[PDB]
Amino acid sequence: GSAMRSAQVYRWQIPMDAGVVLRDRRLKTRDGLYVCLREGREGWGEISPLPGFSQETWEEAQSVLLAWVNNWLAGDCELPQMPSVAFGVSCALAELTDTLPQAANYRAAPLCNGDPDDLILKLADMPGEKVAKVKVGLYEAVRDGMVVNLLLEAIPDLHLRLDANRAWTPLKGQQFAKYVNPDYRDRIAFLEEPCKTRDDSRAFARETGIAIAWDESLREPDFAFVAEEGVRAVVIKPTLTGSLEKVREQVQAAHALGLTAVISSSIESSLGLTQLARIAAWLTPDTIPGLDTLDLMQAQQVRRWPGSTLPVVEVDALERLL
Numbered sequence: 001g002s003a004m005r006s007a008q009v010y011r012w013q014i015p016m017d018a019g020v021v022l023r024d025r026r027l028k029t030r031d032g033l034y035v036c037l038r039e040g041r042e043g044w045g046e047i048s049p050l051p052g053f054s055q056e057t058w059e060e061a062q063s064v065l066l067a068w069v070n071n072w073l074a075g076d077c078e079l080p081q082m083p084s085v086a087f088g089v090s091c092a093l094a095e096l097t098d099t100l101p102q103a104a105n106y107r108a109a110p111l112c113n114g115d116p117d118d119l120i121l122k123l124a125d126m127p128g129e130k131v132a133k134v135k136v137g138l139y140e141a142v143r144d145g146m147v148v149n150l151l152l153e154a155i156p157d158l159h160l161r162l163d164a165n166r167a168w169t170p171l172k173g174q175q176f177a178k179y180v181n182p183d184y185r186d187r188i189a190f191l192e193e194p195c196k197t198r199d200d201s202r203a204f205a206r207e208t209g210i211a212i213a214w215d216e217s218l219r220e221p222d223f224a225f226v227a228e229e230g231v232r233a234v235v236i237k238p239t240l241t242g243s244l245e246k247v248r249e250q251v252q253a254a255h256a257l258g259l260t261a262v263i264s265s266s267i268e269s270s271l272g273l274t275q276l277a278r279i280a281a282w283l284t285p286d287t288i289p290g291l292d293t294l295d296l297m298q299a300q301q302v303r304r305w306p307g308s309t310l311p312v313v314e315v316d317a318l319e320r321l322l
């Protein structure tokens with residue numbers, strides 16, 4: 001019957017597997033925070049800004065987080081605006097009020113790489129809807145186009161999500177596309193951020209008939225959700241976006257425009273990842289999310305991703321700030 005508020009803040013570091021790289025830079029460890037709010041009821045959230053993506057640092061988020069909690073303890077207050085903090089806190093609040101739904105599915109489009117032939121074998125064995133993610137733009141455009149074509153030709157019901165991370169010039173995008181049989185192009189579910197500039201990405205999409213998606217663009221100042229020929233999806237990374245409510249607004253905006261919205265990982269620990277999976281099952285029920293990042297990390301913490309065999313660090317082992 002208690003309406004008594006209490007809270008805890010945890011600070012942590014999860015070792016990454018060797019060789020992880022983010023935007024051509026190495027990532028040794030994943031630093032982050034959790035918040036646990038109690039009212040009589042309990043809710044959790046993950047506050048883990050991502051170096052090189054987030055504007056704020058781990059340390060800054062920590063400060064903002066602690067201050068917000070200090071306020072919440074006295075009664076309801078405005079959300080933080082700092083995105084990682086807003087996300088984690090808003091999730092914790094949602095759990096408290098039981099407004100973040102539970103989900104059946106904890107799924108992710110698998111991030112694929114390596115030998116093309118071996119990949120074919122693996123894809124061939126996928127059950128249900130065959131959707132997979134492949135990074136492009138590391139090799140040269142010809143190689144990427146030929147390999148995508150190989151994969152598409154090999155498995156008629158395969159749908160590939162690609163990600164160029166703004167790698168290409170208009171010419172390189174053309175060189176890539178030339179190698180993909182036009183009859184298969186529709187099975188490129190979307191190609192994230194093909195070109196160096198958004199204008200060029202838009203030209204690519206309109207000119208090649210290959211669907212594109214925005215990702216990084218969503219976080220740039222002045223971004224606007226809009227219907228554009230050839231734009232088929234948006235990639236929403238909650239941790240880099242802000243509140244659960246802002247996230248939901250973004251999904252709604254996308255849907256309103258007939259775009260697919262994909263909930264995507266910012267390399268959160270298992271805790272935040274499970275929350276993303278729930279957000280996805282709730283808000284984007286027909287779109288498998290981009291959450292295949294747990295396997296980059298050495299351990300899970302607090303909350304388990306079903307099916308994972310990674311070791312679990314329990315709350316009692318985490319550093320408490322409060």
Ligand SMILES: O=C(O)CCC(=O)c1ccccc1C(=O)O
Binds near residue numbers: 265290
């Ligand atoms: O979007 C997903 O499928 C998984 C995560 C992903 O792609 C990503 C995750 C963190 C940082 C950068 C990227 C990326 O877009 O390259």
Ligand SMILES: [Mg+2]
Binds near residue numbers: 163165192215
């Ligand atoms: Mg991306």
